[PDB]
Chains A and B, each alone.
Chain A
Amino acid sequence: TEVIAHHWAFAIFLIVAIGLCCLMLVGGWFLGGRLRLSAKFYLVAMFFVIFDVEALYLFAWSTSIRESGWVGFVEAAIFIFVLLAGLVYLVRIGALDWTP
């Protein structure tokens, strides 16, 4: 009898936000009378994807930080060490600088 009201508020918020944008767009509408980009952009998107999925393990670690003891801290520390080893490998090879 409170979370149902909160879910209803979320629903009307979403529905009336999209409805406001729709009515705004149609009120603007009603009145008045062979190449290739690159490969480094794909590489930086792939860096974002892989480090975001490793950041997912950090996301799930951050909620259970206290309930897992020092052994969980050690495991997340060696996880982050592997992550930073990959990042510093990427830094040192030269695949991370842009140089336009």
Chain B
Amino acid sequence: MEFAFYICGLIAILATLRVITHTNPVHALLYLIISLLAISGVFFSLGAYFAGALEIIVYAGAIMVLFVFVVMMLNLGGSEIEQERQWLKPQVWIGPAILSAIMLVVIVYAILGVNDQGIDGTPISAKAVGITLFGPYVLAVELASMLLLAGLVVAFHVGREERAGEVLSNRKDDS
């Protein structure tokens, strides 16, 4: 399982490249969905079966669901921003791209110089993650439950409606 890993990585890079430089956001979210699927295939190819199954269960089955839910909810197509077309102008495109590409070349120079023992087999199943999830790492999942509770409280308090109606036209400053 090495050529599958390489092709999944290549189409993941391609899919997120089409994510970054797209115009309408629902197609970009679809490209991110297939990118998450490819990274899940990468996770499967490295013996992390739980990680890839989790990516499609959680990251592609719940998080992209939230993104498309918001997009399909408030009805953006990117209106008044597609016609501007700021990201497909070059004087904004060279700067951050070559800066973050300098970051890319320096961090992959930092990647090299480490001994290569290779990715081994022995796929770590969910049983090992379970036995090391409630052994040494108990407080991790307890306070992660507390953290998820805090995130739910924050986002519910910030983003509720305060108005009655299952169809609402947009008023400025909520009437």
Contacts and interface: CB of A to CB of B under 8 A. Distances in A.
Given A36-B169, A36-B170, A38-B161, A86 B152 contact: yes
A18 interface: no
B168 A35 contact: yes
B146 interface: yes
Contacts of B145: 54, 57, 79, 82-83
Interface residues of A, number: 40
A39 B151 contact: no
Nearest to A69: B134
Contact of B133 (A36, A48, A64, A83): A64
A95 B152 CA distance: 12
A2 interface: no
Interface string B134-175: 110010011011101101100110011100011111100000
A5 B165 CA distance: 56
Given A54-B148, A61-B134, A76-B134, A46 B155 contact: yes
Interface string B111-143: 000000000000001110111011100100110
Contact of B75 (A35, A68, A82): A35
Contacts of B152: 46-47, 50, 86
Contact of A68 (B134, B144, B161, B168): B134
B73 interface: yes
Contacts of A95: 156, 160
